[PDB]
Amino acid sequence: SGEPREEAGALGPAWDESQLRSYSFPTRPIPRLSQSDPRAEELIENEEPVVLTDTNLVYPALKWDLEYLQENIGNGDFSVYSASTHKFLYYDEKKMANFQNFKPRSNREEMKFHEFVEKLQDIQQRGGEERLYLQQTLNDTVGRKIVMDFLGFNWNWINKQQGKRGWGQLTSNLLLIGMEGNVTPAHYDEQQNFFAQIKGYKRCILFPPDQFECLYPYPVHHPCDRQSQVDFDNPDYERFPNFQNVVGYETVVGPGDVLYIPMYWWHHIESLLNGGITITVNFWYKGAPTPIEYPLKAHQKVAIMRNIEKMLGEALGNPQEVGPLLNTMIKGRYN
Amino acid sequence: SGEPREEAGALGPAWDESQLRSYSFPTRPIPRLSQSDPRAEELIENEEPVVLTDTNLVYPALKWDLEYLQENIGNGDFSVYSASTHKFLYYDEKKMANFQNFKPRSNREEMKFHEFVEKLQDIQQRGGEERLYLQQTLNDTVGRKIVMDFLGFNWNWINKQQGKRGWGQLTSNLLLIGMEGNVTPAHYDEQQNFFAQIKGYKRCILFPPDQFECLYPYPVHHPCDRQSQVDFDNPDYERFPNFQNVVGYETVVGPGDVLYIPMYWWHHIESLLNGGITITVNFWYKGAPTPIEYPLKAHQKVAIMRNIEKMLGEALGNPQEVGPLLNTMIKGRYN
Ligand SMILES: [Fe+2]
Ligand SMILES: [Fe+2]
């Protein structure tokens, strides 16, 4: 992640090591480049991450904070997630029927922005362990002023990018507001992503698709599909031996930086400790349609594994049988 | 060495007897165990060899081959050794001044990886007797990708091991790439060693320190110090009668296996014939510091003999006098 950058006007270090959580694996830096740099386009075209420092993608939102947002976003309701710890356990509600024993670890809740702002205060007053994360799409369903800021994003840049990479439609666009210390555990998404930081700092640790064997994702039919089964804060090396070979790409993004997270790449995101609240807006695009050229890329093998798991759960008429069948196929035959 | 192991997926025998060279002495198997097995720690603590089959020590390098390496290791220069035969005659350049008559039998040469890859091809095209061996330390002086693979080694395992055995610092870390048929003649090293096989198969024949009398190492001041004077392919029983009593410990290591070669143990290493190129990475640690408890271990007597030879060469002001003086001390007095 490197030596903390110095803020303009001698305001000092943007952050210091004591704000970063400690992990068991090594990491090297993600390149930090200007969007006009030919190396930045090269990295994106080859689907490798890059932090673009001067896109002006969310320029108007740089002034956003809780006051400004509460006072201009509207009286609509927002999805707020809460967790007993720093780690947010998200899950797919639609898959809970496949695992009756799964007990949810995170709760969503609809509330008004000021209610969110107020619940935030208390947790700071008492200092409880509870944490929250607000997540909402940028529609026209929000305040007029927020809509103007939104219209002011650099759509020229991102649209051009979307066009040259061959990506599909902008599938999702989320505003995220979190508390210092918040951590979104490692997982991968099937879409291309531009992560635009707005307020505060977030440490992003990415792992290429070829580390599948070291990250142990949950069964595709499980509510936590696409998330790593390993507890980064207490890795169980007996159940997940290859987590000892994992190597990541790291960076700390701040106001104005845009991080490109290529599709299928794992990412672990954390809001720096004692760094104040964080605000980010993500942009997701469907990747480009498959051209079959060999040798296959790692993410294409991951896609094949996901498909085999899905087909099996349908053919057997019950996802709980997938594992027993796979083991039967392999033992004494391929292992 | 036992019955050749069968590779997963019915790919057949990993190797067959016809690939092993024939020798005049008998050998028994080195234990092949899991690193979680209590017997494996017992063997290492008592300084006996063991092949650990599941450490994941060099997991990321299992994908390495010439293409991958040439294309990612860099444009630096590598030490390549060549030999007219299958046996590589290594020597200590600094001791050549003690034996003016010593004429080197192996040559080193600095070249770029693709140059190494190309010279390799020719020797296969023409089928010459010439052979090569590439040897290089794993620094940061190598390509970025190779550095990531390297960072992905299971440092947690080896460091823990280094800690519990009381060993000193990791003194050396070498990458070795050789040709089928290559043989490194018997010799001992003064450091602890973990030999991690990556590609291809190597037959390793070890001899405990107490076989000193049957292996006849060269005089300590000679360029071939620590190497056996006996030609394993044509033992001279008149000059080395006790080579008829030698008994070894043997094993064939393959991708994923890690062989512990305790300090002072002799080892003879050969790349299976018609087995393709071999790749290995070795790790060397200084042994633990001497605690003097009796009865002395064999390697401690070897250390004493080496010291007497060294002191004598200094006291007499010339290493060539060591032998005449030792004979004078012994004849009609201790023999
Ligand atoms: Fe994500
Ligand atoms: Fe050696």
Tab-separated table of C-alpha atoms and ligand atoms in Angstrom, chain A residues 187 189 267 284, ligand 1:
chain	number	residue	atom	x	y	z
A	187	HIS	CA	-15.876	-11.676	-2.246
A	189	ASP	CA	-18.710	-9.908	-8.296
A	267	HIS	CA	-11.905	-7.600	-3.017
A	284	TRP	CA	-21.224	-1.683	-12.168
C	1	FE	FE	-18.109	-6.181	-4.309
